[PDB]
Amino acid sequence: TTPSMEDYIEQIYMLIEEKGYARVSDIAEALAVHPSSVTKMVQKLDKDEYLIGLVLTSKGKKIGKRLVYRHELLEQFLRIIGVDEEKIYNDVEGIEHHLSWNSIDRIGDLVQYFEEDDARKKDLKSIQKK
Amino acid sequence: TTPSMEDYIEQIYMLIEEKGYARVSDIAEALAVHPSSVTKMVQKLDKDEYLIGLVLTSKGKKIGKRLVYRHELLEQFLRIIGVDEEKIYNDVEGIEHHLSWNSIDRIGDLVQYFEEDDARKKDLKSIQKK
Ligand SMILES: [Mn+2]
Ligand SMILES: [Mn+2]
Ligand SMILES: [Mn+2]
Ligand SMILES: [Mn+2]
């Protein structure tokens, strides 16, 4: 659909999960945008049936859950392959909305690959040493 | 060094390697943008000393070479993990300029990990089957 719209749904979903609701102020503060800009996006999200304070439609909820899943999987992926922890978040934030579901699912299989045998993680770590 | 600037340097570097030179028209066609947009960017890259008959400076060449390496490595990464070939290019294009060097290097180690022992690739493929 749209990276910005997705980023908003992701943030709105997280806020609802964290607080039980999503205030415009909290959205604007989390995205570091002006509250007026949030107002415009919300009205658009409303028109597109992602939501109706504000409440997500089942359509918006399904997307939010997917976006959180993708963010979490990507952090786990970068963490597993050894990226410095402090750099993981910004990298995930910048690539998460530009990956196809095919890539996401293959990354999921990759994470599973390393999780079923610690020897694989060690072998990968050895390569980093080289 | 914005993502847009990097994408232009990447394209300019590729055109020079492919044809021996980079015409505004070819850059405009490759990026699917208006020539005025290209001109504005080129003037900016000139001001920032990446280029000067578009000719890259050593600064621009170093970056261009890195960007091509990164693009190729990212395609190999998605390829190795099983992403459908047809979807690889668009994914790489959208994430390549949003990954830290730390992530790129660890992805490089990951690619090396699979390339050095095909048994690892087979094991990864078995998981995709589950
Ligand atoms: Mn996001
Ligand atoms: Mn995220
Ligand atoms: Mn690019
Ligand atoms: Mn590229």
Short mmCIF file of N, CA and C in Angstrom, two decimals, chain A:
data_model
loop_
_atom_site.label_atom_id
_atom_site.label_comp_id
_atom_site.label_asym_id
_atom_site.label_seq_id
_atom_site.Cartn_x
_atom_site.Cartn_y
_atom_site.Cartn_z
N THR A 1 0.85 -1.22 0.00
CA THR A 1 0.00 0.00 0.00
C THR A 1 0.87 1.26 0.00
N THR A 2 1.24 1.71 1.19
CA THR A 2 2.07 2.90 1.33
C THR A 2 2.97 2.78 2.56
N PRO A 3 4.27 3.03 2.39
CA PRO A 3 5.24 2.95 3.49
C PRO A 3 4.88 3.86 4.67
N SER A 4 4.49 5.10 4.38
CA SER A 4 4.11 6.03 5.43
C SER A 4 2.83 5.57 6.12
N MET A 5 1.85 5.15 5.33
CA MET A 5 0.60 4.67 5.89
C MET A 5 0.89 3.46 6.77
N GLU A 6 1.76 2.57 6.28
CA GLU A 6 2.13 1.39 7.04
C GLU A 6 2.83 1.79 8.33
N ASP A 7 3.75 2.74 8.24
CA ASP A 7 4.47 3.18 9.42
C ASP A 7 3.50 3.73 10.47
N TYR A 8 2.47 4.42 10.00
CA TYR A 8 1.45 4.96 10.90
C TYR A 8 0.64 3.84 11.53
N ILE A 9 0.24 2.86 10.73
CA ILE A 9 -0.54 1.74 11.25
C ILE A 9 0.30 0.99 12.27
N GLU A 10 1.57 0.80 11.95
CA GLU A 10 2.48 0.12 12.85
C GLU A 10 2.54 0.85 14.20
N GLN A 11 2.71 2.16 14.15
CA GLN A 11 2.80 2.96 15.36
C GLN A 11 1.48 3.00 16.13
N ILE A 12 0.37 3.12 15.40
CA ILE A 12 -0.94 3.17 16.04
C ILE A 12 -1.25 1.84 16.72
N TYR A 13 -0.90 0.74 16.06
CA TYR A 13 -1.12 -0.59 16.60
C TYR A 13 -0.29 -0.78 17.87
N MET A 14 0.96 -0.33 17.84
CA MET A 14 1.81 -0.48 19.01
C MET A 14 1.28 0.32 20.19
N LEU A 15 0.84 1.55 19.93
CA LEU A 15 0.32 2.41 20.99
C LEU A 15 -0.91 1.78 21.63
N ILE A 16 -1.81 1.26 20.80
CA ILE A 16 -3.00 0.62 21.32
C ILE A 16 -2.59 -0.59 22.17
N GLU A 17 -1.58 -1.33 21.71
CA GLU A 17 -1.12 -2.49 22.47
C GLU A 17 -0.42 -2.07 23.76
N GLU A 18 0.29 -0.94 23.72
CA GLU A 18 1.01 -0.46 24.90
C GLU A 18 0.13 0.25 25.91
N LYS A 19 -0.70 1.17 25.44
CA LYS A 19 -1.56 1.95 26.32
C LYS A 19 -3.03 1.56 26.34
N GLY A 20 -3.50 0.98 25.24
CA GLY A 20 -4.90 0.60 25.15
C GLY A 20 -5.63 1.59 24.26
N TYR A 21 -4.91 2.62 23.83
CA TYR A 21 -5.48 3.66 22.98
C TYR A 21 -4.36 4.40 22.25
N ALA A 22 -4.72 5.16 21.23
CA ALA A 22 -3.72 5.91 20.47
C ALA A 22 -4.11 7.38 20.36
N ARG A 23 -3.45 8.22 21.14
CA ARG A 23 -3.71 9.65 21.13
C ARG A 23 -2.93 10.30 20.00
N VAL A 24 -3.53 11.30 19.37
CA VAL A 24 -2.86 12.01 18.29
C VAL A 24 -1.51 12.51 18.78
N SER A 25 -1.48 13.06 19.99
CA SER A 25 -0.25 13.57 20.56
C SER A 25 0.82 12.47 20.64
N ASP A 26 0.42 11.28 21.09
CA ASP A 26 1.37 10.17 21.20
C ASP A 26 1.84 9.70 19.84
N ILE A 27 0.95 9.77 18.86
CA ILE A 27 1.31 9.34 17.51
C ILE A 27 2.32 10.34 16.95
N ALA A 28 1.98 11.62 17.04
CA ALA A 28 2.84 12.69 16.54
C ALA A 28 4.21 12.65 17.22
N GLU A 29 4.22 12.35 18.51
CA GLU A 29 5.46 12.28 19.27
C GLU A 29 6.30 11.06 18.92
N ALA A 30 5.64 9.94 18.66
CA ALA A 30 6.35 8.71 18.31
C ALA A 30 6.95 8.78 16.91
N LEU A 31 6.25 9.45 16.00
CA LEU A 31 6.72 9.58 14.63
C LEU A 31 7.54 10.85 14.43
N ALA A 32 7.60 11.68 15.47
CA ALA A 32 8.36 12.92 15.41
C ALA A 32 7.82 13.83 14.31
N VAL A 33 6.50 13.89 14.19
CA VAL A 33 5.85 14.73 13.19
C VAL A 33 4.90 15.70 13.88
N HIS A 34 4.46 16.71 13.14
CA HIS A 34 3.55 17.69 13.70
C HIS A 34 2.18 17.04 13.86
N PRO A 35 1.47 17.37 14.95
CA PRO A 35 0.14 16.79 15.17
C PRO A 35 -0.82 17.03 14.01
N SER A 36 -0.67 18.16 13.33
CA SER A 36 -1.53 18.49 12.20
C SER A 36 -1.34 17.46 11.09
N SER A 37 -0.10 17.02 10.90
CA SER A 37 0.22 16.03 9.88
C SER A 37 -0.44 14.69 10.23
N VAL A 38 -0.47 14.37 11.52
CA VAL A 38 -1.08 13.14 11.99
C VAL A 38 -2.57 13.18 11.69
N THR A 39 -3.18 14.34 11.90
CA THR A 39 -4.61 14.52 11.65
C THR A 39 -4.94 14.18 10.20
N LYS A 40 -4.12 14.67 9.28
CA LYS A 40 -4.33 14.42 7.86
C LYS A 40 -4.24 12.93 7.53
N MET A 41 -3.23 12.26 8.07
CA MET A 41 -3.05 10.83 7.82
C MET A 41 -4.20 10.01 8.39
N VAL A 42 -4.62 10.35 9.60
CA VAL A 42 -5.72 9.62 10.24
C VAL A 42 -6.98 9.69 9.39
N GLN A 43 -7.28 10.88 8.87
CA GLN A 43 -8.47 11.05 8.04
C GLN A 43 -8.35 10.19 6.79
N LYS A 44 -7.13 10.03 6.29
CA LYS A 44 -6.88 9.23 5.11
C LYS A 44 -7.02 7.75 5.46
N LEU A 45 -6.48 7.37 6.61
CA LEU A 45 -6.56 5.99 7.07
C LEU A 45 -8.02 5.63 7.30
N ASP A 46 -8.81 6.62 7.72
CA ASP A 46 -10.23 6.43 7.97
C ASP A 46 -10.93 6.17 6.63
N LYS A 47 -10.63 7.00 5.64
CA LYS A 47 -11.24 6.85 4.32
C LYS A 47 -10.90 5.48 3.73
N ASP A 48 -9.66 5.04 3.94
CA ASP A 48 -9.22 3.74 3.42
C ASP A 48 -9.66 2.55 4.27
N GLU A 49 -10.49 2.82 5.27
CA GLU A 49 -11.04 1.79 6.15
C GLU A 49 -10.07 1.03 7.04
N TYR A 50 -8.98 1.68 7.45
CA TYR A 50 -8.03 1.03 8.34
C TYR A 50 -8.41 1.32 9.78
N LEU A 51 -9.16 2.39 9.98
CA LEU A 51 -9.58 2.78 11.32
C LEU A 51 -10.82 3.66 11.27
N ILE A 52 -11.38 3.95 12.44
CA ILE A 52 -12.55 4.82 12.55
C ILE A 52 -12.18 6.06 13.36
N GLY A 53 -10.51 7.10 21.64
CA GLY A 53 -10.11 7.89 20.49
C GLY A 53 -10.29 7.13 19.19
N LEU A 54 -9.21 6.95 18.44
CA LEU A 54 -9.29 6.23 17.19
C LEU A 54 -9.26 4.73 17.46
N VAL A 55 -9.92 3.97 16.59
CA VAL A 55 -10.00 2.52 16.73
C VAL A 55 -9.67 1.86 15.40
N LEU A 56 -8.85 0.82 15.43
CA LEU A 56 -8.48 0.11 14.22
C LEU A 56 -9.60 -0.83 13.79
N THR A 57 -9.79 -0.96 12.48
CA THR A 57 -10.79 -1.87 11.94
C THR A 57 -10.05 -3.20 11.91
N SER A 58 -10.76 -4.30 11.65
CA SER A 58 -10.10 -5.60 11.59
C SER A 58 -9.05 -5.55 10.49
N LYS A 59 -9.33 -4.75 9.47
CA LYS A 59 -8.40 -4.57 8.35
C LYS A 59 -7.10 -3.92 8.84
N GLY A 60 -7.24 -2.88 9.65
CA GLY A 60 -6.08 -2.19 10.18
C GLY A 60 -5.34 -3.01 11.21
N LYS A 61 -6.08 -3.80 11.99
CA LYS A 61 -5.48 -4.65 13.00
C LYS A 61 -4.64 -5.76 12.38
N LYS A 62 -5.16 -6.38 11.33
CA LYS A 62 -4.41 -7.45 10.68
C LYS A 62 -3.09 -6.92 10.17
N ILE A 63 -3.12 -5.72 9.59
CA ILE A 63 -1.90 -5.11 9.06
C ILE A 63 -0.95 -4.74 10.19
N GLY A 64 -1.49 -4.17 11.26
CA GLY A 64 -0.65 -3.80 12.39
C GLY A 64 0.09 -4.99 12.97
N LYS A 65 -0.62 -6.09 13.18
CA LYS A 65 -0.01 -7.30 13.73
C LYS A 65 1.10 -7.77 12.80
N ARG A 66 0.85 -7.70 11.49
CA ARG A 66 1.84 -8.11 10.51
C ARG A 66 3.07 -7.22 10.56
N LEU A 67 2.85 -5.91 10.68
CA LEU A 67 3.96 -4.96 10.71
C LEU A 67 4.82 -5.15 11.96
N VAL A 68 4.19 -5.41 13.10
CA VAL A 68 4.95 -5.63 14.32
C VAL A 68 5.75 -6.92 14.19
N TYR A 69 5.12 -7.94 13.61
CA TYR A 69 5.78 -9.22 13.40
C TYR A 69 7.02 -9.03 12.54
N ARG A 70 6.86 -8.25 11.47
CA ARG A 70 7.97 -8.01 10.56
C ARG A 70 9.09 -7.22 11.23
N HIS A 71 8.73 -6.20 12.01
CA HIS A 71 9.76 -5.41 12.69
C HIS A 71 10.55 -6.32 13.62
N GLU A 72 9.84 -7.10 14.43
CA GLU A 72 10.49 -8.00 15.38
C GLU A 72 11.37 -9.04 14.69
N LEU A 73 10.87 -9.63 13.62
CA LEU A 73 11.64 -10.64 12.89
C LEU A 73 12.92 -10.05 12.33
N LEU A 74 12.84 -8.84 11.79
CA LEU A 74 14.01 -8.19 11.22
C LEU A 74 15.05 -7.85 12.30
N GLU A 75 14.61 -7.45 13.49
CA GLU A 75 15.59 -7.16 14.54
C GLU A 75 16.28 -8.48 14.94
N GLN A 76 15.50 -9.55 15.00
CA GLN A 76 16.06 -10.84 15.38
C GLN A 76 17.07 -11.31 14.34
N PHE A 77 16.74 -11.07 13.07
CA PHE A 77 17.62 -11.43 11.97
C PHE A 77 18.96 -10.70 12.07
N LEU A 78 18.91 -9.38 12.19
CA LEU A 78 20.14 -8.60 12.28
C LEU A 78 20.93 -8.94 13.55
N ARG A 79 20.21 -9.24 14.63
CA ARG A 79 20.86 -9.60 15.88
C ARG A 79 21.58 -10.93 15.73
N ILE A 80 20.89 -11.91 15.16
CA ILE A 80 21.45 -13.24 14.96
C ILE A 80 22.71 -13.22 14.09
N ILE A 81 22.72 -12.40 13.04
CA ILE A 81 23.91 -12.38 12.19
C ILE A 81 25.03 -11.49 12.74
N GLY A 82 24.83 -10.98 13.96
CA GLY A 82 25.87 -10.20 14.62
C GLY A 82 25.97 -8.69 14.49
N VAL A 83 24.93 -8.03 14.00
CA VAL A 83 24.98 -6.57 13.88
C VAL A 83 25.03 -5.96 15.29
N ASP A 84 25.81 -4.90 15.47
CA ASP A 84 25.90 -4.24 16.78
C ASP A 84 24.49 -3.87 17.20
N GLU A 85 24.10 -4.25 18.41
CA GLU A 85 22.75 -3.98 18.89
C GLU A 85 22.26 -2.55 18.69
N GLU A 86 23.10 -1.56 18.97
CA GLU A 86 22.69 -0.16 18.85
C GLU A 86 22.29 0.26 17.44
N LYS A 87 22.77 -0.46 16.43
CA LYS A 87 22.48 -0.12 15.04
C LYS A 87 21.27 -0.83 14.44
N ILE A 88 20.81 -1.87 15.11
CA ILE A 88 19.69 -2.66 14.61
C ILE A 88 18.38 -1.91 14.38
N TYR A 89 17.93 -1.16 15.38
CA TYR A 89 16.66 -0.45 15.25
C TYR A 89 16.55 0.45 14.03
N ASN A 90 17.52 1.35 13.85
CA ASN A 90 17.47 2.27 12.72
C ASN A 90 17.49 1.55 11.38
N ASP A 91 18.24 0.46 11.30
CA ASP A 91 18.29 -0.30 10.06
C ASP A 91 16.94 -0.94 9.77
N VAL A 92 16.35 -1.57 10.79
CA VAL A 92 15.04 -2.19 10.61
C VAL A 92 13.99 -1.15 10.19
N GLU A 93 13.99 0.00 10.87
CA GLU A 93 13.02 1.05 10.55
C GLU A 93 13.08 1.50 9.10
N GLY A 94 14.29 1.48 8.54
CA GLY A 94 14.47 1.92 7.17
C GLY A 94 14.27 0.90 6.07
N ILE A 95 14.29 -0.39 6.40
CA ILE A 95 14.11 -1.42 5.38
C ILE A 95 12.82 -2.22 5.49
N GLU A 96 12.21 -2.21 6.67
CA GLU A 96 11.01 -3.02 6.89
C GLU A 96 9.85 -2.83 5.93
N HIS A 97 9.61 -1.60 5.48
CA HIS A 97 8.49 -1.36 4.58
C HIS A 97 8.84 -1.51 3.11
N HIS A 98 10.07 -1.94 2.83
CA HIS A 98 10.50 -2.10 1.45
C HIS A 98 10.87 -3.53 1.08
N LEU A 99 10.51 -4.47 1.94
CA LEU A 99 10.79 -5.88 1.68
C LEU A 99 9.51 -6.59 1.31
N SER A 100 9.60 -7.48 0.32
CA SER A 100 8.44 -8.24 -0.12
C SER A 100 8.14 -9.30 0.93
N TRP A 101 6.92 -9.83 0.90
CA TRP A 101 6.57 -10.87 1.84
C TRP A 101 7.46 -12.08 1.59
N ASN A 102 7.82 -12.31 0.33
CA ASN A 102 8.68 -13.44 -0.01
C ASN A 102 10.01 -13.30 0.76
N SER A 103 10.62 -12.12 0.72
CA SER A 103 11.88 -11.90 1.44
C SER A 103 11.68 -12.05 2.94
N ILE A 104 10.58 -11.51 3.47
CA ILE A 104 10.32 -11.62 4.90
C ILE A 104 10.23 -13.07 5.32
N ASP A 105 9.46 -13.86 4.57
CA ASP A 105 9.31 -15.26 4.93
C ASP A 105 10.60 -16.06 4.79
N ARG A 106 11.43 -15.72 3.81
CA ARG A 106 12.69 -16.43 3.65
C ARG A 106 13.63 -16.05 4.79
N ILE A 107 13.52 -14.81 5.27
CA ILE A 107 14.35 -14.36 6.38
C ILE A 107 13.86 -15.10 7.62
N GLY A 108 12.56 -15.35 7.67
CA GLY A 108 12.01 -16.09 8.80
C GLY A 108 12.58 -17.51 8.82
N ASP A 109 12.69 -18.13 7.64
CA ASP A 109 13.23 -19.49 7.56
C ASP A 109 14.71 -19.47 7.96
N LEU A 110 15.40 -18.40 7.60
CA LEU A 110 16.82 -18.25 7.91
C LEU A 110 17.02 -18.16 9.42
N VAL A 111 16.17 -17.37 10.08
CA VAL A 111 16.25 -17.22 11.52
C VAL A 111 16.01 -18.58 12.17
N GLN A 112 15.05 -19.33 11.63
CA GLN A 112 14.73 -20.65 12.15
C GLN A 112 15.91 -21.59 11.96
N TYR A 113 16.59 -21.44 10.83
CA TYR A 113 17.76 -22.26 10.51
C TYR A 113 18.82 -22.15 11.61
N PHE A 114 19.12 -20.93 12.03
CA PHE A 114 20.12 -20.73 13.07
C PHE A 114 19.63 -21.10 14.47
N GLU A 115 18.33 -20.99 14.69
CA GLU A 115 17.75 -21.29 15.99
C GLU A 115 17.65 -22.78 16.32
N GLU A 116 17.72 -23.64 15.31
CA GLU A 116 17.61 -25.07 15.58
C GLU A 116 18.95 -25.76 15.84
N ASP A 117 20.05 -25.04 15.65
CA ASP A 117 21.37 -25.61 15.89
C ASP A 117 22.39 -24.52 16.21
N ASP A 118 22.73 -24.39 17.49
CA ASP A 118 23.69 -23.39 17.94
C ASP A 118 25.06 -23.50 17.27
N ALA A 119 25.36 -24.67 16.73
CA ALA A 119 26.64 -24.88 16.06
C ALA A 119 26.70 -24.00 14.81
N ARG A 120 25.54 -23.75 14.22
CA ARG A 120 25.46 -22.92 13.03
C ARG A 120 25.82 -21.48 13.40
N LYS A 121 25.30 -21.02 14.54
CA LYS A 121 25.59 -19.67 15.00
C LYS A 121 27.09 -19.53 15.25
N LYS A 122 27.68 -20.55 15.86
CA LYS A 122 29.11 -20.52 16.15
C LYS A 122 29.93 -20.53 14.87
N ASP A 123 29.52 -21.34 13.90
CA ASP A 123 30.23 -21.40 12.63
C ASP A 123 30.16 -20.05 11.92
N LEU A 124 29.01 -19.39 12.02
CA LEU A 124 28.85 -18.08 11.40
C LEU A 124 29.74 -17.08 12.12
N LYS A 125 29.80 -17.20 13.44
CA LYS A 125 30.61 -16.30 14.26
C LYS A 125 32.09 -16.46 13.92
N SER A 126 32.49 -17.70 13.62
CA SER A 126 33.88 -17.98 13.27
C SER A 126 34.27 -17.26 11.99
N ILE A 127 33.33 -17.18 11.05
CA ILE A 127 33.58 -16.50 9.79
C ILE A 127 33.81 -15.02 10.03
N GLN A 128 33.06 -14.45 10.97
CA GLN A 128 33.20 -13.04 11.30
C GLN A 128 34.60 -12.78 11.85
N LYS A 129 35.14 -13.77 12.54
CA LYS A 129 36.48 -13.65 13.12
C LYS A 129 37.50 -13.58 11.98
N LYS A 130 37.32 -14.46 11.00
CA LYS A 130 38.21 -14.51 9.85
C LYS A 130 38.36 -13.14 9.21
#
